[PDB]
Amino acid sequence: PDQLYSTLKSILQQVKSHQSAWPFMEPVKRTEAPGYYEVIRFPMDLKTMSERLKNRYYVSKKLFMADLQRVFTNCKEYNPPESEYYKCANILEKFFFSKIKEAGLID
Ligand SMILES: [Cl-]
């Protein structure tokens, strides 16, 4: 019945439990990232996604995927190519795509 939330909740949990999710668990802090909030204008992280999900913001699959996609693209825009974050972004992205295909949110 409440099917979309349950599906989105399962995917976000899997993504947050993945061994490469750790750079993305919290908002980037100004202190640790020179000039992030000048270059990345729509920041996103998995804690904020968890909140939005709880707050019933994800009324469409499109809104959820756009937010999760933003986590990865923000990462790749800012971090160096062979940095551990960039490697994490693409591994987690690959896992994201695998799971949203398995749930038929893309098909
Ligand atoms: Cl609830």
Numbering used by the authors: 725 to 831
What wording appears in the published article?
Bromodomains (BRDs) are protein interaction modules that specifically recognize ε-N-lysine acetylation motifs, a key event in the reading process of epigenetic marks. The 61 BRDs in the human genome cluster into eight families based on structure/sequence similarity. Despite large sequence variations, all BRD modules share a conserved fold that comprises a left-handed bundle of four α helices (αZ, αA, αB, αC), linked by loop regions of variable length (ZA and BC loops), which line the Kac binding site and determine binding specificity. The four helices form a deep cavity that is extended by the two loop regions (ZA and BC loops), creating a largely hydrophobic Kac binding pocket.
BRDs are evolutionarily conserved and present in diverse nuclear proteins comprising HATs (GCN5, PCAF), ATP-dependent chromatin-remodeling complexes (BAZ1B), helicases (SMARCA), methyltransferases (MLL, ASH1L), transcriptional coactivators (TRIM/TIF1, TAFs) transcriptional mediators (TAF1), nuclear-scaffolding proteins (PB1), and the BET family (Muller et al., 2011). The nuclear body protein SP140 as well as the related protein LOC93349 and PCAF showed nonspecific binding to most peptides.
